[PDB]
Amino acid sequence: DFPILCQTCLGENPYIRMTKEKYGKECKICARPFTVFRWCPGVRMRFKKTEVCQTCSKLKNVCQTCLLDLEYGLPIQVRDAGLSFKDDMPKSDVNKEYYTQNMEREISNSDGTRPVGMLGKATSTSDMLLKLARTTPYYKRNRPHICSFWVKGECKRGEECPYRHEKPTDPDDPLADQNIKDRYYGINDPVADKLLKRASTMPRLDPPEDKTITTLYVGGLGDTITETDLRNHFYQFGEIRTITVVQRQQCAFIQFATRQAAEVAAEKSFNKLIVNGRRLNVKWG
Amino acid sequence: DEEELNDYKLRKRKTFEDNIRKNRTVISNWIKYAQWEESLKEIQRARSIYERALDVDYRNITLWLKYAEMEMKNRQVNHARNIWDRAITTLPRVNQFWYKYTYMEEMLGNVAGARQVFERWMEWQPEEQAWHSYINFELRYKEVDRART
Amino acid sequence: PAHINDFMFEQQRRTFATYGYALDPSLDNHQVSAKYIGSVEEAEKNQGLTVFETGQKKTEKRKKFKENDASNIDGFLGPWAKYVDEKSEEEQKELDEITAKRQKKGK
Amino acid sequence: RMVEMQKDPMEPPRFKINKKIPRGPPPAPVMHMTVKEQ
Amino acid sequence: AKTVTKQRVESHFDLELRAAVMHDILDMMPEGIKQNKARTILQHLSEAWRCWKAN
Amino acid sequence: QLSKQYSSRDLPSHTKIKYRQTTQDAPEEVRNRD
RNA sequence: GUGCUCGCUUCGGCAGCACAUAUACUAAAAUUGGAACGAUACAGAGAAGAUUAGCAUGGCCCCUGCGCAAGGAUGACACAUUCGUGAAGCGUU
RNA sequence: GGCCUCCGAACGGUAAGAGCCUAGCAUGUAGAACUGGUUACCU
Ligand SMILES: [Mg+2]
Ligand SMILES: [Mg+2]
Ligand SMILES: [Mg+2]
Ligand SMILES: [Mg+2]
Ligand SMILES: [Zn+2]
Ligand SMILES: [Zn+2]
Ligand SMILES: [Zn+2]
């Protein structure tokens, strides 16, 4: 009873009518019958319905319809590229059936609210994916499918047509093909790969222009801030060597015992840290 | 290589599974399968084989020795440590497990660990020889007071 | 569980669906609640008009031709009356192109 | 609002159950020979 | 849940006799510790039964 | 996953339980007896 | 949409009020991959020398069958010579 | 004083298979991208 859901599926209305079938469909993964839920998300929306059984969601920690993580809204291949691939799960036939069975007993014996072993891992995060995690609901995802009479030029329902009248996606784009099983296991997922390419460009971690340099060239200081903000932020890292301050261009230089600590302060800092409700931007030299 | 080796593995692997399914037990089939995967250094597979064999017959002491041995051969100290603990927990009466367990710890250098193991062992009030081995263990170091105790 | 009067549920659901503003249900939002939960452009303007309650003002009716006597044949339209008003080329092309591409991909 | 979906009474069993997958697998401790006898 | 029947009765009786002896004695006789003559003791059983049929 | 299959044998029969009566030899008598 | 306001008040319009309150696996489509016991081709029935009757046993094998019946090739599947290393533990000279 | 049964269907025979090639059969899915930063002092 009650599905497991994204906030993005469930709807942008707080009031929702949602129907239930006892054994509605096989799950497209572990292939068992399971309680299925439909509901209307919104005014122009599509009537989504749960695609996979609740168990294999608890297993990989995901929405039932979307298969996007609960916290990050990221396809599974991504958050695995983000932490731990070694979760695994047999893809192969009768194994899948077997492992699902056992893991279904293991889950039965848990407190109920926890994605099994992954959650022991799931706490430690934020490497990148937080910064590539999506922020707001994305409703373009629930729109009705593309009317396929109209996309041949004919559709004779006129304005009534609940489907959507517009140009489809060119089958050329590798982002088209998108199997379900595939998106689930984290194989060759085009979306996930795209997000990976997007991850790399994040100006961030390579640093190291020069050896031993712990000099921090800090842009976007501002004249509200004091140094004491700086120190009481940065004593976490280690033994400071010193701090140079310039308020004429509002840039603050810093120096630490080891370069390692400076890299760190970059990492922890870059395009993340803000104090005095004002962004504190960092660069090398 | 790349594909040619692979096919070989399917024929062997499949055969192993067939043998097991036919006879179910007869753990020489289990063991041979484990050994083959060990030889190919697919030791994660090997582990699963050993665990499956244990599910069939957890009392079989050769099986456990082969399992622990496999871990040790591949320098997987902590796996071996786990396994030893399980073996003595479920089949405490088997002295072979205890003798090997203490030996392993001694080789690793963990005298304290070995002492702990022996103290567990002694709770079972075992056999004259076990007590002698514990005393001798102590006497490989000076530790005369311990021995007397 | 909850045991909300069904009728009130309908009132809130339609209110939101139609106008975008419905009073929010929460228990511990502040541990006391003073607030609406809609887009709210309508809510300030429409003063929480309920779907069941008559709207204060009426606007913009659209006509559908009707003959209701039924004496006539073929003639007669009942509540089957097809809105008189409602009977891109630019787009008409992009879609086609996409289709072509898809076909090619099938190859 | 959860509502149970109405089932069509003349609908046959939807899907097929027959498929069979091998029984799943810790043992409690047991706590329980002369040459001539051998 | 197959049900005993005329076709299956003789086979049934000998099946559960082989099992009766097997469980009883291998849970009764033992200390071979490895495998004690199960195939063999049963072959002695069938041998004896033939011998009594031949008087 | 419970099958909609049935069988003749399975159907209701003897749904009532014949409790022993007092002259049949209810447990009450038995407890008291020497 | 229907009716009613001794509604404005003519018979046009407008206003108020009452009644009436949320359908739909939306597609008339598009795509996506397991099975026919077809022919063809190769080959060709357990048990012992052969020819055959069969009941069984076991289940990541099924099928026919309302069936806890019975069938499917017994359904198929089931392949006498003569010792010594290496390490560890225990007792002894 | 009487005295008039039944009545038909199923398998147990045409191989068991392995392979290759070619309609057939189910799905009516889920999902489809993203921005904005400073240098300055003694020998
Ligand atoms: Mg025959
Ligand atoms: Mg048969
Ligand atoms: Mg048979
Ligand atoms: Mg026959
Ligand atoms: Zn599933
Ligand atoms: Zn979802
Ligand atoms: Zn259309």
Q: What is the DSSP letter of A62?
A: B
Residue A202 and residue A271: Cα distance in Å, rounded? Answer: 10
Looking at the C1' of nucleotide G29, which residue has the nearest alpha carbon? A148
> Cβ–Cβ of B90/D31 closer than 8 Å?
no
B14 touches strand G (CB under 7 A): no
**Whether the Cβ atoms of residue A45 and residue A107 lie closer than 8 Å to each other:** no
Pairing of strands D2-4, A281-284: unpaired
CATH of A215-284, one of 1.25.40.10, 3.30.70.330, 3.10.20.30, 3.40.50.720: 3.30.70.330
Neighbours of C, requiring at least 3 CB pairs below 8 Å, are A
A154 touches strand G (CB under 7 A): yes
Q: What is the full DSSP assignment across E1-55?
A: -----TTTHHHHHHHHHHHHHHHHHHTTS----S--SHHHHHHHHHHHHHHHH--
Residue B95 and residue B89: Cα distance in Å, rounded? Answer: 12
Q: What is the DSSP letter of B58?
A: T
Other CB atoms within 10 A of residue A187 CB:
12
> Cβ–Cβ of A17/C91 closer than 8 Å?
no
A272 touches strand H (CB under 7 A): no
Token pair recorded at residue A45 = 């929306």
A26 touches strand G (CB under 7 A): no
Task: Mark whether A and D touch (3+ CB pairs within 8 Å).
Answer: yes
Residue B135 and residue B146: Cα distance in Å, rounded? Answer: 8
Q: What is the full DSSP assignment across chain C?
A: -----HHHHHHHHHHHHHHS--BPP-SSSSSS---B-S--HHHHHHTT--SSSPPSS--------------SSSS--SS----SS---TTHHHHHHHHHHHHHHHH-
Give B145's contacts (C-beta < 8 A, 6+ positions apart).
none
Instruction: Select from D3, D6, D16, D17 the residue whose CB has the most chain A CBs within 10 Å, as the one to mutate to test that interface.
Output: D3
Token pair recorded at residue E27 = 């849970």
Residue A191 and residue A207: Cα distance in Å, rounded? Answer: 28
Q: Is A104 helix (H, G, I), strand (E, B) or coil?
A: helix
Helix segments in A71-113, DSSP class H: 76-82, 93-108
A101 touches strand G (CB under 7 A): no
**Comparing C-alpha atoms, which of A146, A184, A144 is closest to residue A48?**
A144
Q: Which helix (H) or strand (E) holds A33?
A: strand A33-39
Residue B30 and residue B24: Cα distance in Å, rounded? Answer: 9
Pairing of strands D2-4, A18-26: parallel
C-alpha distance from residue B126 to each of B92, B98, B134, E33 (Å) = 10, 11, 11, 21
A283 touches strand H (CB under 7 A): yes
Residue A31 φ/ψ region, left for φ over 0, alpha for ψ in the -120 to 50 degree band, beta for the rest: left
> Cβ–Cβ of C86/A168 closer than 8 Å?
no
Protein contacts on strand H: list nucleotides below 7 Å from a Cβ. Answer: 28-34, 36-40
Residue A122 and residue A134: Cα distance in Å, rounded? Answer: 18
**Whether the Cβ atoms of residue A48 and residue A39 lie closer than 8 Å to each other:** yes
Q: What's the resolution in A?
A: 6.5
> Cβ–Cβ of D2/A2 closer than 8 Å?
yes
Closest approach of D16 to chain F, Cα-based (Å): 9
Residue with the two structure tokens 């910064």 = A131
CA of A181 to the centre of ligand 5 (A): 10
Residue B44 and residue A221: Cα distance in Å, rounded? Answer: 53
- Start-to-end CA span in chain F (Å): 54
**Comparing C-alpha atoms, which of A206, A211, A213 is closest to residue A241?**
A213
CA of B56 to the centre of ligand 1 (A): 39
- Give D-chain residues touching B52 at CB under 8 angstroms: 25
Q: What is the DSSP letter of A147?
A: P
Angstrom distance, E2 CA to H15 C1': 28
**Whether the Cβ atoms of residue A264 and residue A270 lie closer than 8 Å to each other:** no
Q: Is A281 helix (H, G, I), strand (E, B) or coil?
A: strand
Q: Is A19 helix (H, G, I), strand (E, B) or coil?
A: strand
Looking at the C1' of nucleotide G66, which residue has the nearest alpha carbon? F7
